[PDB]
Amino acid sequence: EDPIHDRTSDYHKYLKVKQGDSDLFKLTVSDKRYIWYNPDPKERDSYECGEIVSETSDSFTFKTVDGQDRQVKKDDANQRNPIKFDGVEDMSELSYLNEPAVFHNLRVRYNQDLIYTYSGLFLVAVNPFKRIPIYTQEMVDIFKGRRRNEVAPHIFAISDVAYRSMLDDRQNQSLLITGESGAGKTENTKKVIQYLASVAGRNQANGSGVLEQQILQANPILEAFGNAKTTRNNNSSRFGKFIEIQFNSAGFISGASIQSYLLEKSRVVFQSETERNYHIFYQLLAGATAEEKKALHLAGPESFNYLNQSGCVDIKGVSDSEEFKITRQAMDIVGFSQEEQMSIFKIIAGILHLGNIKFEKGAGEGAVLKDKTALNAASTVFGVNPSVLEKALMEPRILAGRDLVAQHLNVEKSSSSRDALVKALYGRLFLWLVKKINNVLCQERKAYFIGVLDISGFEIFKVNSFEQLCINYTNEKLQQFFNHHMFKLEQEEYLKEKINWTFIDFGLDSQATIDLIDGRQPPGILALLDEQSVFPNATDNTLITKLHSHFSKKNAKYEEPRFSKTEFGVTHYAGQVMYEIQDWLEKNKDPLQQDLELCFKDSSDNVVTKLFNDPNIASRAKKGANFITVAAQYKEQLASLMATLETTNPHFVRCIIPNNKQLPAKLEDKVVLDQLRCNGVLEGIRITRKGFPNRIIYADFVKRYRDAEDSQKATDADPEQYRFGITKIFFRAGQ
Ligand SMILES: Oc1ccc(/C=C/c2cc(O)cc(O)c2)cc1
Ligand SMILES: [Mg+2]
C-alpha cells in the first residue's frame, strides 16, 4: 500500500538505493579495511581504493591498484567507510568524514540517479543533466507532511519542512539555493514553487487553482526575457530573483511577489562567441505568424546584428517556435491583454531594428545615417518620430553650464548611445513585466511567507566584466551567509549558553573578499569605482590605476597582474577571477541621452510611453548632485535582501554541477570536489556531528510532548548526548 514501504513503487525505483545482491552482501560483511589514496601525488582529487594490509601505532600500509605497497601516517589517512554506508541518505552518519569519502557517497547515489543527498542539516543536489521522473504529482503527494527522516532526500522534502516550520513556529522561512552557473538552482527553485503551490494550494475548484496557476506561469515569462545561452548553461538566468510565496494565517497560499535583480542588459547588444541573446528574441522570429512578421518587419535572426554575431542562433533540443507558444500561454494565464502582448513584441522587434542602424562618418568627424531603413522600421513599431529619433541619436542636446549645446557624435559615440537606448528599453520592459506580474499575484496582505532565492550563479568567462563582478560578489555574500549561520551564529549560541564548548575555527570566511569589494572605510573596489564615476576626468585607465594603488600588494585577495595593465584579480571563495576594466565607468554611470528619453515619451504606444513616463520605472534616484550609480543601487538592494533573509529561518540547498560539459552520467571528481570544498560542505557536516543542533529554554521545556522551570531532573534516561546552558538545554544529534 504505502509507496515508501512498497519496493515496487516509482518512489522506491527512483528515490531509494537499489537492493544489493548476495555478492555485494559478501563484500559488505568482509573484515578487510580500505583507504582512499592518490595514485598520483599531483592529482590530489583523483582517488583509488587500497586495502590496508598492516599497521603500526601511527601508520597504515596498503596495497595500491597496481600492486605496490604504500605507507601513510594515520593522521593523514583518508579511510574508506564500511561499504554498508555507500549510498547513505544523510552523510552525517558516515563513520569517516573526509573528502574522498564524501565524494564517493555522492558518486554511488549519482550512479543510480539519486541526485539528492543530505549533508547534515542541508541538502545537496548534483545536476543530472537528464530527465528523472521524480517530480510528478504522485511524488508530491508522498512527501506531504512527512518528517525529513521518514522519507528519502528530495527538494520536496526540504520544501515541506520549511512549510511545517512556518506553521509550527509562526516564523517566516527562506530557501537559499546556492551553486555556480549551471549547477541546478533554477530547476530546483521551480520545484520548490511547484511543491508549495500544490501542498498549500486551494483544494477546491478551477478558480481555487487560478492564483497557484498564475504563480507557476510567471516563470516561463521571466525566463523567456531573462534567460539566455552562455558557454556554461543553455538556460542561464541573467537576472537574480527572490520569490516570496505568501500564506494566510490558515497556512494557505494567499499570493506571491517577485523581486528581480541585476539584469544583464549588455547581453541585448553583445554576446560572446557561441552564446545567444535572450531566448525571447529567437522565440519571436521563429514562432511569429506571417502576419505579425509583416507588421513587425521581422526576418531571420541572421538578418540582425544583435543576433548574428555569436555564430549561434539555436539551442540543441530546444524549439524556439514551440517555446514562443509556451511564453504566450503564460502571458494569457497571468493576465497580459492581447494589446499589451503586441506592444511587448513591438518593443522586442523595435530593439532588433535599432541594432541594424549603421552609423557612418560624414564630411567631418560627426556621424550620419545614409540608409534609414532600420531607423524607420524601428520608429514605426515603437511609434515615434524617426526624424526626432535620428537627431536624438547623433545630435543629442546637453547643457554646458546653463547653455543648450547640440552635440554631433561620431560613429563610435552614436553607436554607443543607440546601444544605451536599447539596453534602457529592454531593462525597463523587464521591470515592467515583473511589475505587472506582481500586481496580479499580490491580492492580499500575507500572514507569512517562504522566500526562495535564485540568483545568477558564480561564473568565470575568458572576459569578465562589471556584470561578473556583481554576480560573483553576490555569490560570495550568499556563501558568507551560509558560513554565518552554520558556524558563527551556531557557536556564539554555545558561548552564550556556556555549555562547555571550545570554539572551533572552521577556516571558512569570505569577509576579506567581501570587504575588498564593498567596503567603505577604507574604500573597496565599488567605492573607488563610484568615486571615479563622478570625477569629470576619469578614464578606464585612471580607474584601474586607482584600484592598483589602493590594493596592489596591500590586500591579500587582490592581485595586480604582471601580464596585463587593464585587469585585476579578486580571490573569491570559488576561485580567483580576473576582471577586465574596459567600460566600467560607463556601465556604472549607465548614461542615456535625455533627448532619447524625450523622443520616446511621445511614443504612441501605451507600453512604450509607460516605460519612459512611469517614475518607478523611468526615474532614477538623483541622490546627491549625481544620479545613483549601478554599484550603489545594487549594493543597496543586496543589503536590503540580506536584512530580509535575516528575519527568516534559512534552509540551504547546495547545487553541485558534475562537470563543465553539461553532460549526464559524467561525474568529474576534480570539478565536484572543488565545489564541495569552497561550499564548506564537509565543515557543515562536522559542525553538525560535533555540535548540539537542537535546544530549548528550560522554563519552556516542560514536555511539549510538573511546572517549576528547571528542566529539573526531567532526566528521561545520556550525560554525553546533551548539555545545560545558562537558559536552555542542548542535544547532541538525535532526539
Ligand atoms: O547534452 C548537451 C547539451 C548542450 C551542451 C552544450 C554545448 C555547448 C555549446 C556551445 O556553443 C558552447 C558551450 O560552452 C557548450 C552539451 C551537452
Ligand atoms: Mg539559473
mmCIF file of C-alpha atoms and ligand atoms in Angstrom, residues 185-186 227 233 235-237 454-455, ligand 2:
data_model
loop_
_atom_site.group_PDB
_atom_site.id
_atom_site.type_symbol
_atom_site.label_atom_id
_atom_site.label_comp_id
_atom_site.label_asym_id
_atom_site.label_seq_id
_atom_site.Cartn_x
_atom_site.Cartn_y
_atom_site.Cartn_z
ATOM 1 C CA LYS A 185 19.458 26.433 -8.875
ATOM 2 C CA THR A 186 16.667 27.453 -11.245
ATOM 3 C CA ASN A 227 17.463 33.712 -19.568
ATOM 4 C CA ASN A 233 24.461 26.879 -19.331
ATOM 5 C CA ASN A 235 19.319 28.278 -19.935
ATOM 6 C CA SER A 236 21.412 30.667 -17.841
ATOM 7 C CA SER A 237 19.448 33.075 -15.640
ATOM 8 C CA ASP A 454 17.519 32.035 -7.161
ATOM 9 C CA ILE A 455 20.450 34.238 -8.208
HETATM 10 MG MG MG B 2 19.516 29.855 -13.191
#
